[PDB]
Design brief:
Chain B: Keywords: Antiviral defense, Endonuclease, Hydrolase, Magnesium, Metal-binding, Nuclease. Chain B: It comes from Treponema denticola (strain ATCC 35405 / DSM 14222 / CIP 103919 / JCM 8153 / KCTC 15104). Chain B: It holds the Pfam family CRISPR_Cas2. The structure holds 2 chains of a larger assembly. Helix content of chain A is about 35%, strand content about 25%. Chain A has 3 helices and 5 strands. Chain A has one domain (about 1-75): Alpha-Beta Plaits. By secondary structure, chain A is an alpha+beta fold. Chain A is flat, with a radius of gyration of 15 Å.
Chain lengths: ~90, ~90
């Protein structure tokens, strides 16, 4: 499991445009949102992983930081989830 | 090992922004290193301490937002790929 998390400027309209362009690129590459600015994708082997990361490099935004972490599916399923308004209640 | 905290907190209102700084401060106080605006990490030398860290984050959680806590090896953390934004048509020094 490949995790892409990024820290991009959001001050200007052009910053925000550039943010949306990079997000759409990730979506277009099969990445799913885990939370804001954090996306993940299962990969079958490390060749596929390296190729994903190379494509991120070629499509990176003009400013900001993008980091790529690779973990096992077990490590990912053991992630602790903490939600502020935690209760589940229907109307 | 390393504990990575990914947080997605609202910043729409003044209360949201205050609570954002409170949580970030709690992470600093706790010895987490900022990695990105919304991603902090801490070296863990003893797996016993991991469960203690998670319980503390749970007790100190902000009133709204998503906090996800991932445990990875030192090697996975050291080999993270760091990609720096750059224009496709940047001038070179």
């Amino acid at each position: 499991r490949v995790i892409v998390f990024f820290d991009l400027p959001v001050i200007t309209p052009e910053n925000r445009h550039n943010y949306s362009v990079f997000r759409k690129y990730l979506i277009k590459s099969g990445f799913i949102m885990q939370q804001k600015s954090v996306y993940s994708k299962l990969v079958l082997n490390l060749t596929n992983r390296d190729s994903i990361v190379k494509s991120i490099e070629k499509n990176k935004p003009p400013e900001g930081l993008v980091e790529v972490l690779t973990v096992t599916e077990k490590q990912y399923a053991k992630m602790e989830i903490i939600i502020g308004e935690s209760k589940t209640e229907y109307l």
